[PDB]
Amino acid sequence: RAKVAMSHFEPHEYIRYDLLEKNIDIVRKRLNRPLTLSEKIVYGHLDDPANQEIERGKTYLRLRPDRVAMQDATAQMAMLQFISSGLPKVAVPSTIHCDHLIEAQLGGEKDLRRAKDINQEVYNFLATAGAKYGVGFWRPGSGIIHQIILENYAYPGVLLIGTDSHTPNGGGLGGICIGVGGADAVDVMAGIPWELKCPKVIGVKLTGSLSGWTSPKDVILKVAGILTVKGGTGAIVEYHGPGVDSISCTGMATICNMGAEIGATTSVFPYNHRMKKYLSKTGRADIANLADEFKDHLVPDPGCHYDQVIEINLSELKPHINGPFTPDLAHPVAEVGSVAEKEGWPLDIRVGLIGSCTNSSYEDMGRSAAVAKQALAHGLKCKSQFTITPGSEQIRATIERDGYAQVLRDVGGIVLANACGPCIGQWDRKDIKKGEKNTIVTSYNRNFTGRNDANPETHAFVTSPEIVTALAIAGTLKFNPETDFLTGKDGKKFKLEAPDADELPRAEFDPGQDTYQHPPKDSSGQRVDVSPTSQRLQLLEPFDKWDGKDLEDLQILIKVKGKCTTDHISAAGPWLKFRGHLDNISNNLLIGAINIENRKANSVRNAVTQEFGPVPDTARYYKQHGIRWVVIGDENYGEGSSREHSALEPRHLGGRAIITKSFARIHETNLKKQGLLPLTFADPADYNKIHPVDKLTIQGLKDFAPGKPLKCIIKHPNGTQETILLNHTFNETQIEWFRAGSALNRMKELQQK
Numbered sequence: 110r111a112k113v114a115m116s117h118f119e120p121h122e123y124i125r126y127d128l129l130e131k132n133i134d135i136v137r138k139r140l141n142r143p144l145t146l147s148e149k150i151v152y153g154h155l156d157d158p159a160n161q162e163i164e165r166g167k168t169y170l171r172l173r174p175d176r177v178a179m180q181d182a183t184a185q186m187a188m189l190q191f192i193s194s195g196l197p198k199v200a201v202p203s204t205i206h207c208d209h210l211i212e213a214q215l216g217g218e219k220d221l222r223r224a225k226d227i228n229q230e231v232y233n234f235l236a237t238a239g240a241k242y243g244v245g246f247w248r249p250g251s252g253i254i255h256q257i258i259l260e261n262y263a264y265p266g267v268l269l270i271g272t273d274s275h276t277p278n279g280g281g282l283g284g285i286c287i288g289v290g291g292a293d294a295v296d297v298m299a300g301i302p303w304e305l306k307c308p309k310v311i312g313v314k315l316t317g318s319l320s321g322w323t324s325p326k327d328v329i330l331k332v333a334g335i336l337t338v339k340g341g342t343g344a345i346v347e348y349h350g351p352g353v354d355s356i357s358c359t360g361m362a363t364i365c366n367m368g369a370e371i372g373a374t375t376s377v378f379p380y381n382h383r384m385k386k387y388l389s390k391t392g393r394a395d396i397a398n399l400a401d402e403f404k405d406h407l408v409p410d411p412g413c414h415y416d417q418v419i420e421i422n423l424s425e426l427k428p429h430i431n432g433p434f435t436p437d438l439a440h441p442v443a444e445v446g447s448v449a450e451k452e453g454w455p456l457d458i459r460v461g462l463i464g465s466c467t468n469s470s471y472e473d474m475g476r477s478a479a480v481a482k483q484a485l486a487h488g489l490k491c492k493s494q495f496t497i498t499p500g501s502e503q504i505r506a507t508i509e510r511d512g513y514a515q516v517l518r519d520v521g522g523i524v525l526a527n528a529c530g531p532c533i534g535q536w537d538r539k540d541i542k543k544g545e546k547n548t549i550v551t552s553y554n555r556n557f558t559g560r561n562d563a564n565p566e567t568h569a570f571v572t573s574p575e576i577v578t579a580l581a582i583a584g585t586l587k588f589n590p591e592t593d594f595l596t597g598k599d600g601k602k603f604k605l606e607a608p609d610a611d612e613l614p615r616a617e618f619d620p621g622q623d624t625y626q627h628p629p630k631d632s633s634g635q636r637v638d639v640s641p642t643s644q645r646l647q648l649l650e651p652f653d654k655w656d657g658k659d660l661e662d663l664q665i666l667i668k669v670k671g672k673c674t675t676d677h678i679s680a681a682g683p684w685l686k687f688r689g690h691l692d693n694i695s696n697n698l699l700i701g702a703i704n705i706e707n708r709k710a711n712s713v714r715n716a717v718t719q720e721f722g723p724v725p726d727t728a729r730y731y732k733q734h735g736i737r738w739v740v741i742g743d744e745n746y747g748e749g750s751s752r753e754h755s756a757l758e759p760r761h762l763g764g765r766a767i768i769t770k771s772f773a774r775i776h777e778t779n780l781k782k783q784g785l786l787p788l789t790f791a792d793p794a795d796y797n798k799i800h801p802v803d804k805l806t807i808q809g810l811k812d813f814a815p816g817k818p819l820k821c822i823i824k825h826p827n828g829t830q831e832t833i834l835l836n837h838t839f840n841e842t843q844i845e846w847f848r849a850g851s852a853l854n855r856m857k858e859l860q861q862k
């Protein structure tokens with residue numbers, strides 16, 4: 110067909126829209142109905158379009174992704190599992206992005222220099238494993254993974270998977286970009302079909318157009334308050350309607366990004382002229398030209414069916430601020446001042462933080478700068494502390510050039526390295542004592558307990574970058590930028606005009622310094638060295654194969670009450686130091702989860718000793734003594750981040766099964782991948798029949814089968830037993846992972862020995 114390369118770094122890897130077209134046509138012949146846009150891109154990437162059973166919410170699709178992207182907090186364990194596979198080279202375009210391990214402390218260059226010193230061992234391991242297996246490497250300082258992907262790798266119709274739950278960001282350029290755990294990335298780098306449960310499709314019709322202070326972030330802050338954090342589970346969110354053309358390409362990426370907070374498989378927007386424009390300004394006019402010739406396959410079919418439709422009128426949407434400890438507690442900015450007051454949420458804002466992958470684009474920096482120049486024109490500066498993270502080197506170089514960074518420095522902000530930083534708790538915060546109740550407002554996405562600064566009483570609210578700037582200048586939540594007055598230096602009351610800024614640089618982007626490192630596709634005879642006494646890296650020992658028996662008299666390690674996020678199961682911040690060391694990071698296992706017995710975090714009863722202690726220590730004690738254990742959880746267990754450490758750690762410390770009312774998708778897949786049994790109650794009221802003291806037998810593992818429930822015998826202390834039924838969503842591919850001990854063990858059996 111055309112020979113248009115997938116990116117500037119892979120001149121020989123061509124976009125296959127011909128293949129996409131061919132597969133869409135095979136599938137629509139079978140289904141005889143309109144296809145949504147997500148169905149076109151997803152079913153157009155099927156391994157076997159002619160034979161695949163396609164039922165939304167029901168069948169597992171065997172897909173062929175176009176490329177794999179990893180960031181350095183998850184790439185370590187994905188590459189250690191790739192090293193166990195024994196395979197010589199990755200089968201599809203793959204990149205590593207070093208963005209998670211740069212701690213904010215001093216700002217910019219100083220923080221970057223220090224992270225390069227502190228994290229040398231890790232960055233060295235990833236560059237070397239990258240050179241050897243043929244993975245591209247974006248060096249520290251290059252930018253947050255999703256901003257580098259939008260700028261260089263996402264195009265209309267791509268199917269991309271990434272080891273990070275905010276990989277949906279790339280839906281802002283018309284592709285299907287899905288968050289997975291490191292073991293799923295290994296399947297694709299290994300060349301075997303990736304499986305995904307066929308999604309439902311929620312259509313969101315946008316009407317009207319944005320104006321004034323309302324920005325793209327408000328659309329997804331409103332959708333999250335509507336759907337709630339579990340409302341998107343099992344579905345792709347597909348935006349459509351006349352209002353779509355009112356949003357910039359990075360604005361579309363913001364809305365798709367935070368779809369992660371409602372549990373959605375991903376989100377996507379149809380190819381339009383704002384995307385074409387962004388592709389041309391990022392050096393990819395030939396890809397825009399080819400997508401124009403294939404435009405039919407890059408928009409939804411007329412009259413396609415959504416399983417749920419939501420309609421939002423962009424012209425009536427007002428500025429929102431969500432939180433404090435869930436991203437779906439939504440408030441208009443005009444009322445957060447009074448709800449806070451009523452609820453006892455601290456009103457004075459300590460720190461205002463703009464950035465993260467959700468809101469770090471050129472336009473976000475221009476709109477924040479536009480608020481800040483108005484304050485400056487009245488002789489004001491931020492009352493709160495104010496930090497700014499540019500999403501990539503190209504954006505840092507261009508906002509510097511076009512004057513935005515200096516305005517933001519002059520109102521009192523500190524520009525941080527192009528990295529996650531305070532968003533995953535990589536922040537050396539010292540203005541509050543630990544346990545001090547305080548409020549910070551961010552333009553981030555999650556705001557779970559102790560995620561930004563490990564302080565559980567920090568109240569974090571997420572909003573748009575221009576509203577963080579306005580509230581940082583006022584320093585109080587009781588300020589509405591739309592209505593209220595600030596007092597300048599000169600004694601006059603003045604009002605903030607709504608920010609206006611260009612979506613893209615008028616001139617071209619300044620690319621900044623060189624940060625990509627191509628694999629030697631010649632040499633590749635690197636030895637990857639992992640010191641056997643390293644505290645940060647450790648080669649994996651394979652998990653045990655299933656012994657062929659039922660699981661009798663399992664001890665309950667903990668019965669969790671309430672919300673149990675992957676940040677509750679395997680915290681980040683200081684623990685990021687150990688993301689390549691399974692035994693060392695297992696010391697944070699479930700330390701944030703609330704135990705129903707006492708309502709305490711990290712305090713469970715050891716069954717043998719009858720002493721209450723830390724959860725990691727109690728799991729190690731049971732493991733040491735041969736006691737197999739179980740976790741009993743509530744609804745949406747595993748909400749959040751895709752980090753597979755939340756599944757690897759319970760497997761390492763002797764866990765066998767996790768029985769909940771429901772699971773978030775990526776955690777449930779990670780649990781099956783590591784050879785654990787994720788099971789749900791056939792009747793959620795049975796959660797109330799199980800007490801911490803009871804022992805459980807899971808029965809019927811011998812004829813474990815797709816669609817057949819498992820019998821659980823609850824053994825009460827008084828001799829009383831009760832049988833309940835537990836559902837599972839395993840197909841026969843996944844039952845093989847369980848029988849082998851893990852998915853990686855199974856792949857190694859298929860290597861003929």
Ligand code: SF4
Pocket residue numbers: 253254273275464465466467528529530532533554
């Ligand atoms: S959500 Fe935060 S921690 Fe996760 S990739 Fe984005 S900026 Fe980094």
